[PDB]
């Protein structure tokens, strides 16, 4: 590379997996009330 850089994303994929797990557990256990 000749003066071009790639920046890393703020949220690592582990955090995204954690969000998806939280959402899915919530919808399994509490219906739509947690929304």
């Amino acid at each position: 590379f000749n003066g071009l850089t790639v920046l890393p994303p703020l949220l690592t994929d582990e955090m995204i997996a954690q969000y998806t797990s939280a959402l899915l557990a919530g919808t399994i256990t509490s219906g739509w009330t947690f929304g």
Partner: protein, 197 residues
């Protein structure tokens, strides 16, 4: 097993990579000058001509950079539109049950589950689809004792000999009763009323 299913994410990655590749490849063009490297132009001429040669390289590279930036802006706008749609789907079809037809799924929506992907999201939609139909004869109202009866909810059907009321999306006959029907007027202005008890 099956491949070529995640076409969109691969397409995005390929487009970005190709844009960077052509941008870096552009650094090997004369743009009308004598060479594509600065050192040789510096070492093979005098300043009054070296600057003339350098100016062409400068303007060409600047133009290429501008083109790259504009392409990036357009593609970013499109990606933002897609992300807004994804957020709306996550809010409406995961945290609730949606009534707008075909918004998330093909059928009557029941629920949805999210999953993550390298640069996007995947929705699993769980829907309900009816099957195994059957023909029936119907009528809009029942005339009895000179009065007209309509179903509270459901529909009148007959298997050729007797009449029943059913819910509209699943066959489940029941005997017509004064508890699942209501009355309004006499049986004179309705087109297709039938006689029963």
């Amino acid at each position: 097993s099956t491949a070529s299913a995640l076409g969109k994410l691969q397409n995005v990655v390929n487009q970005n990579a190709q844009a960077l590749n052509t941008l870096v490849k552009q650094l090997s063009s004369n743009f009308g000058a004598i060479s594509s490297v600065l050192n040789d132009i510096l070492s093979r001429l005098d300043p009054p001509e070296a600057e003339v040669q350098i100016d062409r390289l400068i303007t060409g590279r600047l133009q290429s950079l501008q083109t790259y930036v504009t392409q990036q802006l357009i593609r970013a706008a499109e990606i933002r539109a897609s992300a807004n749609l994804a957020a709306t789907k996550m809010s409406e079809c995961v945290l609730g049950q949606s009534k707008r037809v075909d918004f998330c799924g093909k059928g009557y929506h029941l629920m949805s589950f999210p999953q993550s992907a390298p640069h996007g999201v995947v929705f699993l939609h769980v829907t309900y689809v009816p099957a195994q139909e059957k023909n029936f004869t119907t009528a809009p109202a029942i005339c009895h004792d000179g009065k007209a009866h309509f179903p509270r909810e459901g529909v009148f059907v007959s298997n050729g000999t007797h009449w029943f009321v059913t819910q509209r999306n699943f066959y489940e006959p029941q005997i017509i009763t004064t508890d699942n029907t209501f009355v309004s007027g006499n049986c004179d202005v309705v087109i297709g009323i039938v006689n029963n008890t």
